[PDB]
Design a protein around this ligand. Structure first.
Ligand SMILES: OC[C@H]1O[C@@H](O)[C@H](O)[C@@H](O)[C@@H]1O
Ligand SMILES: [Ca+2]
Length: 306
């Protein structure tokens, strides 16, 4: 009797997707006529592909798919199409072409560039309020940047737009180091430690991370080098990160609204499973099959709101 919805999470121990997956499990458990079949793809698209085959064998009436491979939507769509099963992609955004190739494909996520713009504005505000951060007193921000996984739309947009926004405001920037840490805390700690062991160590004025997990790794490397005075900025507003905004270990972040992305994903998947319009009975705004949930800047000054 219960409507089965298959869900794949690209990697369960991704800090942000852990918040999302626990929220969507809660949403489903609050709803009686639904059974969620949850899968950890263990950061391997081949594993996810096999999981989708199994979910289809089990007759799920909708799929909610958080891709491993940024470009794998077409592969997933062709599996789903064979059984007329709708697919709500979430958090890793397929191409416009992929979404348009299947009348039952949808996406729930964010306007990726917005998070870069907000982060840049946040840095600009704090830079202006903390001119002691300009260690070499040249009027430019000497920064290092910890990038997410290449090709992930959030990594690409946050990396491009944080710097564009600063520069557009009239703040010149100098990139001292930039590398991916693949969204991961331990990789970011190791990378930041390398940078703090290299010739630019002393010159680094601001650490910019594409997410909070990498920001937290940087914070722990700075602590080990007795350089916690160097500001670090993140994205996601993870609970662990907000505690660092409060303690002063993290200068700022940006809410990536996991609870509403989870709810929208669930709501659309359940409507589609039921053969209804994707947004029926909800306030979600679907624009060409996409729901985007706003980001919100967070620092000590507005922390009491969160
Ligand atoms: O796809 C996973 C990534 O999604 C991004 O939107 C989040 O900001 C990251 O923390 C996360 O690692
Ligand atoms: Ca400077």
């Amino acid at each position: 009797a219960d409507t089965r919805i298959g869900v794949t999470i690209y990697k369960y121990d991704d800090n942000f997707m852990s918040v999302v997956r626990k929220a969507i499990e809660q949403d489903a458990k609050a709803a009686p006529d639904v059974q969620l079949l949850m899968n950890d793809s263990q950061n391997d698209q081949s594993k996810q592909n096999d999981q989708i085959d199994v979910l289809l064998a089990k007759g799920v009436k909708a799929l909610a798919i958080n891709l491993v491979d940024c470009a794998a939507a077409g592969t997933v769509i062709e599996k789903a199409r064979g059984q007329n099963v709708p697919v709500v992609f979430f958090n890793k955004e397929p191409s416009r072409k992929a979404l348009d190739s299947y009348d039952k494909a949808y996406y729930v996520g964010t306007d990726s560039k917005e998070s870069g713009i907000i982060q840049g504005d946040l840095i600009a505000k704090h830079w202006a309020a903390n001119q002691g951060w300009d260690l070499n007193k040249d009027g430019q921000i000497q920064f290092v940047l910890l990038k997410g996984e290449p090709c992930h739309p959030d990594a690409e947009a946050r990396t491009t737009y944080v710097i564009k926004e600063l520069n557009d405001k009239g703040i010149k920037t100098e990139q001292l180091q930039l590398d991916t840490a693949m969204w991961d805390t331990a990789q970011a700690k190791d990378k930041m430690d390398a940078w703090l062991s290299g010739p630019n160590a002393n010159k680094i004025e601001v650490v910019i991370a594409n997410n909070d997990a990498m920001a937290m790794g940087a914070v722990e490397a700075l602590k080990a080098h007795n350089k916690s005075s160097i500001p670090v900025f993140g994205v996601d507003a993870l609970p662990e990160a907000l505690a660092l905004v409060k303690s002063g270990a993290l200068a700022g972040t940006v809410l990536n609204d996991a609870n509403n992305q989870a709810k929208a994903t669930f709501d659309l998947a359940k409507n589609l499973a039921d053969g209804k319009g994707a947004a029926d009975g909800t306030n979600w705004k679907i624009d060409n099959k996409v729901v985007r949930v706003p980001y919100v800047g967070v620092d000590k000054d507005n922390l009491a709101e969160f």
